[PDB]
Design a protein around this nucleic acid. Structure first.
Ligand SMILES: [Mg+2]
Ligand SMILES: [Mg+2]
Ligand SMILES: [Mg+2]
Ligand SMILES: [Mg+2]
Ligand SMILES: [Mg+2]
Ligand SMILES: [Zn+2]
Lengths: 114, 82, 66, 101, 177
RNA sequence: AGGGCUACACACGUGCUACAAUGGCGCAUACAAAGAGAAGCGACCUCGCGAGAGCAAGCGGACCUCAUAAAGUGCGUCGUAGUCCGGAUUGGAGUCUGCAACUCGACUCCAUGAAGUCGGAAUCGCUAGUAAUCGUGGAUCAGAAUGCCACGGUGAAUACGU
RNA sequence: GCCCGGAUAGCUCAGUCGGUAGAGCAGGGGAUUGAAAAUCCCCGUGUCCUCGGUUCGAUUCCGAGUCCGGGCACCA
RNA sequence: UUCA
């Protein structure tokens, strides 16, 4: 439960409760569980602290919660420091990955306040 | 991004101009056109005037502006907001 | 200095990108891993060329159409 | 009809098919495990970028033959939709006629 | 600061013999370094001063003196006796430590650095410049901070001439573009 | 030759995916059609999560290619929840083709994976294999549409009446 | 000087024995019409005149004022 | 209720 400083759920099959990490989707979830070597749909509650330790030294290979936090931080700050098209889209709150804007792209756009 | 097998791409005019640059002084920028060109080592340190479609606006090459293309720093539309 | 009015004033090392020990008696309070010292920095030398990092030009010359 | 663009098209196509098979053996250098990955397929892209852009199998437009209409081309007849319909209703086109099913 | 002893031996060992002086007292020397952020736009936001002076408290080692305007003007809407700017006077080993920090871990970290000026002098050897990418100093976390305010920083010298200013600066090698 | 026609405080019209248990995903396996193809389609076969790379037959064709149709069914898992729902949003690592993928592409891989809890006034379409859904292909095509055109699987509701 | 009345949205105003901001108007967006009207759907819009004490809790209770109005007032 |  406690692994990576986060508090993944109990009675939720491990192959999915592993994915609760900000830095591990299903890919790293399945990969770490295979590298450690435990059955698939076991609930996290049935996993001992030594199993948590194996998972700990295994996720110590992938990027983790705070690692990915600082990584995305440094990447966007890199785009900024460059001050490119991507960085300016970022800083001004617009789509970045090359989409249309006039009507759609509401996530990058914001709400309809004015 | 570009196919790795093809490696990078850069047009020979800017290539040779910036070679001359790294050779014999660089106090002046380059008035290129090829916005798509891959930033190379021998362009670092200059203040290249990259084309925006109408102007060749300056941008200083930094060790972080290496894995990029020239136009990435010359905006193409004068945005002002509403 | 007036007592109990200024930030902490411990001494710190020039924890540069290569670790050239040039101590700083500063306010940062931590051995901040910086880039700027005799070892590993540009204008700690002329005709600047940062030797070898992950950085950009390293991996660029690693792909490079090698 | 702005014949200048039709002449553009024929010029580009003729030049491309005259330089034909040259850019072929230039680009083939770029996809194969030879060339030391640093010298020959590297100078090949320089050769290519020096080659005319007006002589590529892609920079053309594929305009019609009747009046070089930009849009609505049809490779099967080299005409715009308009003129292929005209020829159909004239009977010019063998086998063509209004169909339903 | 090692830079002070660097002075005490090498800078005199250079300057006495260059300007063929007849006294060590006659040797030009630096006495104080005043850093300043004349914010001015803090007339609207009172908290910007505390936001601003925080950099002096960080970049310099001393809690800054917030400077109050001298005349209520019409051009900038300011009232007299108003928290307009901030300053820090650094002398002693504080000055020398800060100048070491500057010229070593912050100055070369300037981005796009063609170099300093070779003419920033009052006519009496007291050099004065100003930086704008202040985070070049490792003293700023530059990630929780608000803005990238610069400053203007003067180095008051006893050198009564600009040539002597250039010399005393190139002593610590002072990029000089 | 670059640029934009891809701008974006903003309105409106289309269409796609959703907001999920007739449902999310894994395993197993089967039932279609309509096509298209010669600088094109590309077999088989190895490798790369994978885009694809390589090798590269046959096919101007009821013969080779795209070729898994999907929706289906069996078993399983999820267990009514910003969910194991979504998938937009960004970050990084590629593949493709193009002289050239920044502005300004498709695809692939990793991680956050968001508003979204059936929608207001209103308003649209549909009378039978029709809508509703599910997938398939072709032209435009150097690449590149949820678009257009065409295809086939499931497959209903109510018509009293003006 | 006495008694009374009030201030509430961007305008017209409600209600208070304390559990809490409404409606009209209004503006903006939309819906309907062949087009706009009215209409309808929406959104916006409050530190309830001001300050201060009272009670688990205030526009509402109180105090202390800002104005404005009504009526009545001392003969330095 | 109106257009004009
Ligand atoms: Mg003191
Ligand atoms: Mg455009
Ligand atoms: Mg999902
Ligand atoms: Mg009918
Ligand atoms: Mg269309
Ligand atoms: Zn170093």
């Amino acid at each position: 439960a406690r692994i990576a400083g986060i508090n993944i759920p109990d009675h939720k099959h491990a192959v999915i409760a592993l994915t609760s990490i900000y830095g591990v989707g299903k890919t790293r979830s399945k990969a770490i569980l295979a590298a450690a070597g435990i059955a698939e749909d076991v609930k996290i509650s049935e996993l001992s602290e030594g199993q948590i330790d194996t998972l700990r030294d295994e996720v110590a290979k992938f990027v983790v919660e705070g690692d990915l936090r600082r990584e995305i931080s440094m990447s966007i700050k890199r785009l900024m420091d460059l001050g490119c098209y991507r960085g300016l889209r970022h800083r001004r709150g617009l789509p970045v990955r090359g989409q249309r804007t006039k009507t759609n792209a509401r996530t990058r756009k914001g709400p309809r306040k004015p | 991004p570009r196919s790795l097998k093809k490696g990078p791409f850069i047009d020979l005019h800017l290539l040779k101009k910036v070679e001359k640059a790294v050779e014999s002084g660089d106090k002046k920028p380059l008035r290129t056109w090829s916005r798509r060109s891959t930033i190379f080592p021998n362009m670092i340190g200059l203040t290249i005037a990259v084309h925006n479609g109408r102007q060749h606006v300056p941008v200083f090459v930094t060790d972080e502006m290496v894995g990029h293309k020239l136009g990435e720093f010359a905006p193409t539309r004068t945005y002002r907001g509403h | 200095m007036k007592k109990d009015i200024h930030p902490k004033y411990e001494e710190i090392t020039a924890s540069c990108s290569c670790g050239n020990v040039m101590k700083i008696r500063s306010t940062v309070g931590h051995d901040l891993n910086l880039d700027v010292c005799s070892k590993c920095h540009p204008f700690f030398t002329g005709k600047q060329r940062d030797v070898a990092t992950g950085g950009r030009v390293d991996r660029f010359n690693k792909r490079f159409n090698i | 009809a702005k014949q200048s663009m039709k002449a553009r098209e024929v010029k580009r196509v003729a030049l491309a098919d005259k330089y034909f098979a040259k850019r072929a053996e230039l680009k083939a250098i770029i996809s194969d495990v030879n060339a030391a990955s640093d010298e020959d397929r590297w100078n090949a892209v320089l050769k290519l970028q020096t080659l005319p852009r007006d002589s590529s199998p892609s920079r053309q437009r594929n305009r019609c033959r009747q009046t070089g209409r930009p849009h609505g081309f049809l490779r099967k007849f080299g005409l715009s939709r308009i003129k292929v319909r005209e020829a159909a209703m004239r009977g010019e086109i063998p086998g063509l006629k209004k169909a339903s099913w | 600061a090692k830079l002070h002893d660097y002075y005490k031996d090498e800078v005199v060992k250079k300057l006495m013999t260059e300007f063929n002086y007849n006294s060590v007292m006659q040797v030009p020397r630096v006495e104080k370094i005043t850093l300043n952020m004349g914010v001015g736009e803090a007339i609207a936001d009172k908290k910007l001063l505390d936001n601003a002076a925080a950099d002096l408290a960080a970049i310099s080692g001393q809690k800054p003196l917030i400077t109050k305007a001298r005349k209520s003007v019409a051009g900038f809407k300011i009232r007299q006796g108003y928290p307009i700017g901030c300053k820090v006077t650094l002398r002693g080993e504080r000055m020398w430590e800060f100048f070491e920090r500057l010229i070593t871990i912050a100055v070369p970290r300037i981005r796009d650095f063609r170099g300093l000026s070779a003419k920033s002098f009052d006519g009496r050897g007291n050099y004065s410049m100003g930086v704008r990418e202040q985070i070049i100093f490792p003293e700023i976390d530059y990630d929780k901070v608000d803005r990238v305010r610069g400053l203007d920083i003067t180095i008051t010298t006893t050198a009564k001439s600009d040539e002597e200013g250039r010399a005393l600066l190139a002593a610590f090698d002072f990029p000089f573009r």
